[PDB]
Amino acid sequence: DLADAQAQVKQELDAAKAQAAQLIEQANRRAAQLIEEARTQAAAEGERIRQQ
């Protein structure tokens, strides 16, 4: 009876693992627009090159 109850714990562990996945998804998805903004500024740098 105890072993049967024990399998259920594994499902919870799997759920936690799946939850981490969202952490990583958000974290590295952030990096995309981080790059976007930074070299958007780099486009602004080409811009004031053009202004010079």
């Binding site: 080409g46 811009e47 053009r50």
Partner: protein
């Protein structure tokens, strides 16, 4: 950025013409003022009467 550059180029290109024309008309004003031809007065009024 490039379009802004072009617009500035065009702005200067047109602007210069304005002061050029102002100088030209000031010269024309001077020339007409030195012109003292009432003969031209008679000629031009006769010309208009003909156009009339």
């Amino acid at each position: 950025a490039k379009e802004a550059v072009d617009q500035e180029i065009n702005s200067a290109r047109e602007e210069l013409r304005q002061q050029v024309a102002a100088l030209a008309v000031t010269g024309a004003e001077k020339i007409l003022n030195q012109q003292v031809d009432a003969e031209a007065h008679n000629a031009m009024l006769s010309q208009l009467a003909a156009k009339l």
